[PDB]
């Protein structure tokens, strides 16, 4: 045999191509909003203090 | 641009625009209103280099005296508003009151030449403030925190 072993967090296939997927792929778009959010209300808070 | 805008041509419009010396309506110039329309236009952009700003005006050299004559160094874009507010300012030697219809137009012209000059200067970080990790201050730029001077 080829002694390569693989191993696969989830595996699927779809259309000829084979598919996998981690655990961090479906919360790429939550995160990187919620950095943007966070960031923008920093300094607009430290623009006009009083 | 295109013929140089020179100091008396500024002080003959202002007085034809009020129907003081002009041959539209009777004619008559007088050359002691010429000197001192020129001196008033010279004082008054002086005090222009303060509120309005800088626009390019050429002042006397040295001691010397304005006269009519000398260019005056300002674009073409500027001769309405200027002329308007000189006339409004030399018009109390001859007596005279403004008309509204006078007033409003220098009012357009003067708020003309306010909207070639606004800067809205922008106000920056403060300098305490950090820079995020996104940003990586590590290798790609230097000093984390803002300078916020310079």
Redesign the interface.
């Given at each position: 045999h080829i002694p390569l072993i693989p191993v696969y967090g989830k595996r699927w296939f779809i259309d000829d191509i084979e598919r996998v997927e981690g655990h961090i792929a479906k919360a790429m778009d939550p995160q990187r909003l919620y950095?943007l959010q966070v960031?923008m209300l920093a300094?607009t808070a430290?623009?006009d203090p009083g | 641009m295109a013929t140089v805008l020179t100091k008396g041509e500024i002080v003959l419009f202002a007085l034809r625009k009020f129907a003081i010396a002009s041959n539209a309506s009777l004619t008559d110039v007088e050359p002691q209103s010429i000197e001192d329309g020129v001196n008033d236009l010279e004082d008054m952009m002086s005090e222009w280099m303060i509120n309005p700003g800088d626009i390019g005006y050429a002042f006397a050299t040295g001691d010397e005296q304005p006269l009519p004559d000398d260019e005056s160094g300002l674009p073409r874009k500027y001769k309405h508003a200027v002329g308007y507010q000189l006339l409004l300012r030399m018009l109390s030697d001859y007596s005279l009151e403004p008309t509204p219809q006078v007033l409003s137009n220098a009012q357009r012209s003067y708020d003309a030449l306010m909207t070639d000059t606004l800067v809205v200067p922008s106000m920056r970080r403060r300098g305490d403030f950090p820079v995020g990790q996104g940003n990586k201050y590590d290798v790609f730029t230097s000093d984390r925190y803002y300078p916020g001077d310079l």
């Open positions: 950095n960031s300094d430290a623009q | -």
